[PDB]
Amino acid sequence: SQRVLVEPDAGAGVAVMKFKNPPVNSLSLEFLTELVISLEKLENDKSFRGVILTSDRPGVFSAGLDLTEMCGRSPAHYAGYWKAVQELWLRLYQSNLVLVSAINGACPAGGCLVALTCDYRILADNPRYCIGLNETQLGIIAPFWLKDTLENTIGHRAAERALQLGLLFPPAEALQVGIVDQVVPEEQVQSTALSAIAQWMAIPDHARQLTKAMMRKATASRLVTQRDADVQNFVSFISKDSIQKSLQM
Amino acid sequence: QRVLVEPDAGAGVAVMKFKNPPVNSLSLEFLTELVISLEKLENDKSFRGVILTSDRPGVFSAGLDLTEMCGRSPAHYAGYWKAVQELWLRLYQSNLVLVSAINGACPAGGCLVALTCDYRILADNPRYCIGLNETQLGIIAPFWLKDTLENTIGHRAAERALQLGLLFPPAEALQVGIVDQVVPEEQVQSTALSAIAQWMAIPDHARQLTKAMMRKATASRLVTQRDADVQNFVSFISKDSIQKSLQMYL
Amino acid sequence: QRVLVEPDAGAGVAVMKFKNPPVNSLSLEFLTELVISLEKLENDKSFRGVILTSDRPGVFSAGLDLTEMCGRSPAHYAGYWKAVQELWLRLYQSNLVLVSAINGACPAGGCLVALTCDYRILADNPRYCIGLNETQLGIIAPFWLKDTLENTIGHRAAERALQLGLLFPPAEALQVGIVDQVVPEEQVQSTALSAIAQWMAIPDHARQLTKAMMRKATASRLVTQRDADVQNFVSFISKDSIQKSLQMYLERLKEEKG
Numbered sequence: 001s002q003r004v005l006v007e008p009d010a011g012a013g014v015a016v017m018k019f020k021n022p023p024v025n026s027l028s029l030e031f032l033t034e035l036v037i038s039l040e041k042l043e044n045d046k047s048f049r050g051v052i053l054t055s056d057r058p059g060v061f062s063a064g065l066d067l068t069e070m071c072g073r074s075p076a077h078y079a080g081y082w083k084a085v086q087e088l089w090l091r092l093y094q095s096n097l098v099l100v101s102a103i104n105g106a107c108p109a110g111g112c113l114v115a116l117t118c119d120y121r122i123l124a125d126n127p128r129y130c131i132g133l134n135e136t137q138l139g140i141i142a143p144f145w146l147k148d149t150l151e152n153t154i155g156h157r158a159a160e161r162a163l164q165l166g167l168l169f170p171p172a173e174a175l176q177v178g179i180v181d182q183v184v185p186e187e188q189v190q191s192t193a194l195s196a197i198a199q200w201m202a203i204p205d206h207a208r209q210l211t212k213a214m215m216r217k218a219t220a221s222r223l224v225t226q227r228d229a230d231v232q233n234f235v236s237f238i239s240k241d242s243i244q245k246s247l248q249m
Numbered sequence: 250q251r252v253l254v255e256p257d258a259g260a261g262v263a264v265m266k267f268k269n270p271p272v273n274s275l276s277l278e279f280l281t282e283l284v285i286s287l288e289k290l291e292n293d294k295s296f297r298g299v300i301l302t303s304d305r306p307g308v309f310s311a312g313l314d315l316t317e318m319c320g321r322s323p324a325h326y327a328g329y330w331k332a333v334q335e336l337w338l339r340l341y342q343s344n345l346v347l348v349s350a351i352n353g354a355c356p357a358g359g360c361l362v363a364l365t366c367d368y369r370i371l372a373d374n375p376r377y378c379i380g381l382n383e384t385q386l387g388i389i390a391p392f393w394l395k396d397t398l399e400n401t402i403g404h405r406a407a408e409r410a411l412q413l414g415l416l417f418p419p420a421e422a423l424q425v426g427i428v429d430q431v432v433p434e435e436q437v438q439s440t441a442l443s444a445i446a447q448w449m450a451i452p453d454h455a456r457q458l459t460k461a462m463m464r465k466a467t468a469s470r471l472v473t474q475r476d477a478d479v480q481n482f483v484s485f486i487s488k489d490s491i492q493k494s495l496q497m498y499l
Numbered sequence: 500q501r502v503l504v505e506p507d508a509g510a511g512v513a514v515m516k517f518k519n520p521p522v523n524s525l526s527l528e529f530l531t532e533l534v535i536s537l538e539k540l541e542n543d544k545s546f547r548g549v550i551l552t553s554d555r556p557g558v559f560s561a562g563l564d565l566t567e568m569c570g571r572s573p574a575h576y577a578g579y580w581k582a583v584q585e586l587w588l589r590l591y592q593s594n595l596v597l598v599s600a601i602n603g604a605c606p607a608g609g610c611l612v613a614l615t616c617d618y619r620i621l622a623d624n625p626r627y628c629i630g631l632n633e634t635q636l637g638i639i640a641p642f643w644l645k646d647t648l649e650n651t652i653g654h655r656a657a658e659r660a661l662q663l664g665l666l667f668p669p670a671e672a673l674q675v676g677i678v679d680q681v682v683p684e685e686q687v688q689s690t691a692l693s694a695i696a697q698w699m700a701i702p703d704h705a706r707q708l709t710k711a712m713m714r715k716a717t718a719s720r721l722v723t724q725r726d727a728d729v730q731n732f733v734s735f736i737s738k739d740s741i742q743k744s745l746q747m748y749l750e751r752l753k754e755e756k757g
């Protein structure tokens with residue numbers, strides 16, 4: 001609602017979901033929560049079969065995980081929040097909708113939780129709009145399921161390098177490694193996303209959905225079957241006094 | 250008659266030419282002719298490599314014969330699918346060197362045949378597009394064919410290619426990696442002979458053990474649940490929407 | 500030493516230079532020196548990255564030492580293979596940043612070493628070919644090495660590379676992805692230093708945990724079946740047809756130089 005602007009075109013069967021959590025679309029719990037609710041409503045609305053995800057304001061697609069949500073909070077809150085992080089990944093990655101990311105800003109690790117779970121990724125050709133899983137730069141590591149998603153996007157070798165170096169690929173490099181599908185002038189990102197979704201939405205819907213599910217079920221299952229353990233892993237880590245301290249920078 | 254096997258002079262390599270006009274559709278009869286012909290060549294110690302190609306250029310294979318899948322009884326659907334599986338299993342695990350000289354369009358089931366080979370050469374004609382276009386008809390590739398594609402072009406590219414049901418023209422096919430070479434159409438056959446010579450020069454047992462190490466896990470995923478896959482095929486293809494699309498198409 | 504270590508503790512990097520002439524063959528002796536040298540650098544808190552290269556350009560490593568595998572006792576073959584496995588395990592799971600400065604030809608066992616590194620730079624000399632050429636010797640790559648190759652270049656390319664036993668010259672090596680950069684010969688060492696400067700700058704533990712996340716499944720496949728894999732090597736290499744293939748190849752090798 002507040003933090004997610006939905007612009008629907010029911011006649012076309014398309015909606016645009018614009019992120020509106022300034023200054024940087026950080027993944028706060030309200031934002032994570034609002035994103036999933038909004039996606040779910042578009043899923044259950046049979047009028048809508050494709051969604052374009054983008055920032056309302058260009059510059060930052062999403063800054064990623066939000067520090068306020070993870071600093072000096074309750075054990076309860078941490079569990080609710082990593083559960084909400086997982087939920088967003090799961091619901092995006094398994095959505096029956098066609099999902100296209102119109103990446104009109106920088107896209108570090110948590111922004112990649114969103115971009116990598118879409119069906120197609122278009123990046124604006126702005127040298128500031130770098131994309132990748134940069135966890136190691138901050139002294140942390142990608143969740144296994146996010147690593148898996150990246151491996152599913154760019155292959156094992158490139159994921160090994162990208163994750164260890166915590167690379168944020170500038171647009172030409174991002175295209176070359178395959179983390180995005182197209183790079184276009186910034187003024188053409190939304191038109192390119194429209195052209196892309198027209199093509200994807202034209203596929204017979206059930207067959208497309210079944211095909212998508214066959215491709216992604218093993219990866220999604222790995223998180224569904226270990227989900228509580230994965231929350232506990234997060235909680236134990238960030239509940240540490242010493243990690244809490246290091247959040248302090 | 251549906252499959253011509255032309256031994257090269259000096260043996261070693263044979264050319265298998267598809268001849269089930271008009272589009273080399275994989276009828277049940279053609280499927281079993283391909284399997285027997287391949288087995289003969291395997292068992293003949295004079296032959297260790299085969300080039301697969303159409304007798305007439307234009308269409309490599311249109312794929313599955315939709316008439317085997319539209320008017321028919323549940324048992325017919327099941328026996329047909331068992332034969333489709335058999336062809337994939339036997340090609341994919343063949344001890345022969347298999348090279349495709351792709352001298353025509355190569356949609357879904359044709360692309361199956363191609364993807365099971367060790368090397369794929371595509372004639373440079375803009376009509377000769379290759380891919381797994383099942384979703385165009387509202388159908389999906391079976392898991393083992395999806396795995397064969399992923400094993401060819403990687404996960405991301407397969408995710409896109411299968412969902413969009415894409416047929417790649419030659420330059421795009423080469424870029425995505427679904428074929429290994431693109432050459433002028435009047436050179437496809439000679440190029441295949443040159444390319445298979447590289448493979449024929451490998452110590453034969455070592456080559457075969459290596460091929461098996463690369464492919465056995467993928468094949469075994471189907472071997473372990475082959476009857477399940479037949480019943481899933483029969484249930485899926487028997488749905489009324491699917492039947493209507495095939496009949497319309499036919 | 501057959502392994503020359505040149506340290507730069509202030510920069511946190513050491514260069515490990517192979518010096519087992521004439522072609523840095525992986526004898527049992529040399530294998531164990533490499534394992535120990537790597538463990539000493541791991542344990543030394545001053546070092547976090549290592550560049551592997553040949554002291555003498557021309558051959559990075561000729562790979563496994565055929566004289567260890569030809570006409571020897573079954574226990575010799577087993578002990579040899581346990582050491583080969585040990586080198587792969589230690590390299591592949593090293594907590595160090597490992598960069599190969601590939602300054603020579605790099606056939607199968609050499610490629611074992613290169614593929615276990617985090618980054619591979621190949622000198623642009625048309626004779627400096629890299630690949631898993633086991634099938635040209637009438638043998639095959641072990642499953643774990645096949646997995647390492649697939650983890651480097653993907654399934655399709657591994658299929659072709661392994662069956663054909665390809666030794667990729669530099670341009671083809673870069674195109675297939677088996678190395679990460681191809682540079683003029685006189686830049687291979689400087690490129691490796693530039694590369695490793697960047698890798699060593701990453702928060703160390705996070706890098707290590709990430710590397711483990713990417714590699715533990717592959718390594719575990721050998722660890723859990725390790726003595727079976729020794730048994731399989733001995734049984735396979737002992738076949739008379741394989742002994743024959745290996746002694747013919749050895750004989751061919753000797754003839755091509757003397």
Ligand SMILES: CCCCCCCC(=O)SCCNC(=O)CCNC(=O)[C@H](O)C(C)(C)COP(=O)(O)OP(=O)(O)OC[C@H]1O[C@@H](n2cnc3c(N)ncnc32)[C@H](O)[C@@H]1OP(=O)(O)O
Binds near residue numbers: 732
């Ligand atoms: C189931 C699992 C199975 C097994 C997995 C095995 C993995 C493997 O490593 S297999 C071996 C792969 N290695 C090779 O193919 C390299 C063989 N060597 C060569 O082609 C060349 O020697 C090469 C590349 C070093 C070029 O150097 P160059 O100086 O031009 O040639 P070369 O004349 O051979 O070198 C000189 C000496 O090194 C020896 N040599 C070279 N390679 C080897 C080797 N792999 N083993 C032992 N000796 C070797 C030569 O025989 C010769 O001396 P000598 O006959 O007295 O031992």
